[PDB]
Amino acid sequence: VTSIPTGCNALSGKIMSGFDANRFFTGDWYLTHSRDSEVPVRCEKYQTGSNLQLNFNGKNGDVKCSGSTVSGNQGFYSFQCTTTSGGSFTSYMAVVETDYANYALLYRCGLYGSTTPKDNFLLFNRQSSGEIPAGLSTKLNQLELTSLNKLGCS
Numbered sequence: 001v002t003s004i005p006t007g008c009n010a011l012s013g014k015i016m017s018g019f020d021a022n023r024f025f026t027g028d029w030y031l032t033h034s035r036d037s038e039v040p041v042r043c044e045k046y047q048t049g050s051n052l053q054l055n056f057n058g059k060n061g062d063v064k065c066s067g068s069t070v071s072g073n074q075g076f077y078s079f080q081c082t083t084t085s086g087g088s089f090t091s092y093m094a095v096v097e098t099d100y101a102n103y104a105l106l107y108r109c110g111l112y113g114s115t116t117p118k119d120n121f122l123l124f125n126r127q128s129s130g131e132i133p134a135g136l137s138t139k140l141n142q143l144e145l146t147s148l149n150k151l152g153c154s
Contacts, residue, residue, distance in 0.1 A: 003072040004092050007116030008109035014143065015075040016097045023100040025052060029124035033132055033148040036120050043128065043153035052077060054093075060085040067093075092116070096139060102126050103133045105140070121145055128153040 004010065031044040047055045052067030061084035070076035075094040082088050090111040098104035104124040109116040121143070123132060132140070132148055140146060 001068050001070050001078040004070055004076055004078075004109060005111055005114060005116040008092055008119060009107065010073055011075070011094060011096065011107060014096060014139075015094055019075060019095055019098075020100065021052065024095055024098055024104060025049065025054070027126070029104065029126065030128040030130065030153045031056075031122055031151060032125045032128070032130045032153045033123035033150055034120055035122075035145055035148060037149040037151060041150070041152040043151060045128075046124065052079075054079060058083060060087060063087075065091065093122075096121075096143075097136060098124075099135055103130065103136060105136055105145075121148070123148055125153075 025048040027048060029046040029048070031046065044056050044058070054065040054067060056063050063081050063083050065079040065081040067077040067079045070078055070092070073094070077093055079091045079093060081091055092109040092111065094107045096105040096107055102125065106122040106124060108120050108122055110118045140148070
């Protein structure tokens with residue numbers, strides 16, 4: 001995979017340097033806040049594994065994803081995901097900024113056919129009780145993500 005779909009923001013100049021994929025893809029993350037949210041809110045727990053694995057409890061059952069680097073868009077991964085209800089889809093994600101030990105801001109792009117129909121920014125927290133962290137305030141102000149929605153974790 002060389003580039004992200006049209007409709008997906010490349011985030012030029014916005015992604016952290018020195019990303020350590022191994023430290024991000026270890027341990028659990030809770031999706032505590034997001035730019036866009038649907039009713040009813042949920043608590044999605046993401047589990048990680050070696051070779052860019054990302055699982056979570058999705059709307060329609062458990063989702064299991066395997067990632068691949070996107071060479072032309074630094075920081076982006078293409079995830080191939082399957083679900084227990086028989087779904088199969090591709091999702092692009094980039095870790096915009098993380099401290100590994102507490103929080104990570106992610107950008108996500110969907111895929112339908114060859115284009116991205118919808119995107120979102122996701123706040124991952126190591127604790128289900130996590131806040132919008134002070135440690136992201138510079139980046140959130142830069143991206144004008146200043147009212148992230150609280151989801152269903154606590």
